[PDB]
Design a protein around this ligand. Structure first.
Ligand SMILES: COc1ccc(Cl)cc1CC(=O)N1CCC[C@H](C(N)=O)C1
Ligand SMILES: [Zn+2]
Length: 139
């Protein structure tokens, strides 16, 4: 579990969304695993606008923060599950590090702010869904 709160928006994993997230829907995308909904209060998370390839992420299964090197956003094959069948997920970044299914929602950060959230993992690797291209979140 985990979400990003910026201004009047809430950013969550599409497969972990609630009934209140769908009733106050702004934008959704299956191939990215993302969902955005509206909120009454004003959030204070700073979203980064950069080309960084190193940062720090939170891992709830270990209760630790870990520094990692990661790849550029691209299409990567994701195996079948109970939420989505076998497909290619777009805007995905990979890193070497520990990960478990309950860790989806953990925030990735750099010196400029928020980069993305935990989405995929396994075999000793970890995947992050990028949010730096969505300029409408700041306006
Ligand atoms: C961080 O999640 C994991 C970590 C380790 C392992 Cl063995 C497995 C997982 C779970 C995982 O990758 N998915 C199941 C939920 C939907 C995800 C998606 N974005 O399509 C894919
Ligand atoms: Zn940066």
């Amino acid at each position: 579990s985990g979400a990003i709160y910026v201004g009047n928006y809430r950013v969550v994993n599409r497969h972990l969304a609630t009934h209140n997230d769908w009733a106050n829907l702004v934008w959704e995308d299956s191939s990215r695993d993302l969902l955005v909904s509206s909120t009454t209060a004003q959030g204070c998370d700073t979203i980064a606008r950069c080309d960084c390839q190193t940062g720090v992420y939170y891992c709830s299964s270990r209760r630790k923060h870990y520094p990692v090197s990661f790849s550029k956003p691209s299409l990567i094959f994701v195996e079948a599950s109970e939420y989505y069948p076998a497909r290619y997920q777009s805007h995905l970044m990979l890193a070497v590090g520990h990960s478990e299914p309950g860790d989806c929602g953990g925030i990735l950060r750099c010196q400029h702010g928020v980069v993305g959230i935990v989405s995929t993992g396994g075999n000793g690797l970890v995947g992050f869904a990028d949010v730096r291209d969505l300029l409408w979140l700041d306006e």
